[PDB]
Design a protein around this ligand. Structure first.
Ligand SMILES: *[C@@H]1O[C@H](CO)[C@@H](O)[C@H](O)[C@H]1NC(C)=O
Ligand SMILES: *[C@@H]1O[C@H](CO)[C@@H](O)[C@H](O)[C@H]1NC(C)=O
Lengths: 49, 50
């Protein structure tokens, strides 16, 4: 699903030392969950980059 | 969770605040017995304090 693919992409960003990123999304209805998940992971700061 | 008798500077300040702002004090000790900060635990996915 989108949730686990997002985690894999965030692990890829952890690798290669990529810390700054921008979100570009379409009006596709199936990506509001993606935006919410990315925002929640950004709010998660106890671990990770 | 037996009731103890804790007192000192902080309780005096709390009593002053309660008298000045109509507060009621229900002092209870922290279960963890520590100040509590950010730390990593099992299933490290959510950000939480202790
Ligand atoms: C809190 O401050 C406001 C503004 O000064 C005051 O009107 C109010 O009475 C205060 N609260 C108490 C419990 O006194
Ligand atoms: C505290 O409560 C009593 C009764 O409820 C009231 O008469 C008194 O004015 C209150 N104190 C303040 C600072 O508002």
């Amino acid at each position: 699903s989108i949730q686990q693919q997002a985690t894999v992409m965030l692990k890829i960003m952890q690798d290669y030392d990529w810390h700054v990123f921008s979100l570009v999304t379409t009006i596709f209805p199936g990506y509001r969950e993606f935006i919410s998940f990315v925002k929640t992971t950004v709010d998660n700061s106890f671990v990770g980059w | 969770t037996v009731p103890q008798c804790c007192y000192g500077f902080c309780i005096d300040l709390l009593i002053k605040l309660a008298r000045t702002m109509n507060f009621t004090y229900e002092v209870h000790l922290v279960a963890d017995g520590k100040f509590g900060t950010q730390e990593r635990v099992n299933n490290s996915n959510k950000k939480e304090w202790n």
